Amino acid sequence: KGEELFTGVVPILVELDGDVNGHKFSVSGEGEGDATYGKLTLKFICTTGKLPVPWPTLVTTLVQCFARYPDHMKQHDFFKSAMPEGYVQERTIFFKDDGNYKTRAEVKFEGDTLVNRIELKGIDFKEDGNILGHKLEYNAISDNVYITADKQKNGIKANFKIRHNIEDGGVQLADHYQQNTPIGDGPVLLPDNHYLSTQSALSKDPNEKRDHMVLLEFVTAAGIT
């Protein structure tokens, strides 16, 4: 029944509060998603001024309920099955040879709007590392989110890697460990193993003077034939 909430375009709101090594910041986002095509269009603003970490490092934190699940995979979509009451999404993101983010978010409907409210804490970062030193390129990320059921917690876990390009030519690995659990008591779908193929394209609004990120993203479930 949660699936039917995603047959059309759904407005999205995102609100993040962050503290990375004592550098506090907030981000707001607006846009919409259409799970029929796995398509997200979102614009994010740093409401506190300058973002103290690179925008690309916040993409995965800033609504996998918008994934396109093929018809033959509908029984494996935990994310929509938890709606409208929602789910908790928690991650640890380890940046190789640098610090880590720990994130806790609640994703749920408020009326007709899908809302992602996030708290992010970052620790152990190097002040002249690739994150606090803003050495990461601003282009695109693309990878696969590998999902497995967590039957004991009535939810799912996921793991994946993001390889952020460094301006001087290298790569900054971000190892992601994820858990999702329903907020409500309604039955949810516990999926067989599969993944979300995700492509995020990052751009700028030429008329926007605030520190910001425009995102066009596609999310497609795969791995079951």
Structural method? X-ray
Structure tokens at 119: 């708290």
Are the beta carbons of 79 and 67 closer than 8 angstroms?
yes
What resolution in angstroms, rounded to 1 decimal? 1.5
Q: Compute the distance between CA of residue 47 and CA of residue 99 in angstroms, rounded to an integer.
A: 24
Structure tokens at 72: 């033959």
Domain positions in the chain are 1-225
Structure tokens at 178: 């994820």
Query: Which CATH number describes the domain made up of 1-225?
Result: 2.40.155.10
**Which among 180, 164, 70 is positioned nearest to 116, based on CA atoms?**
180
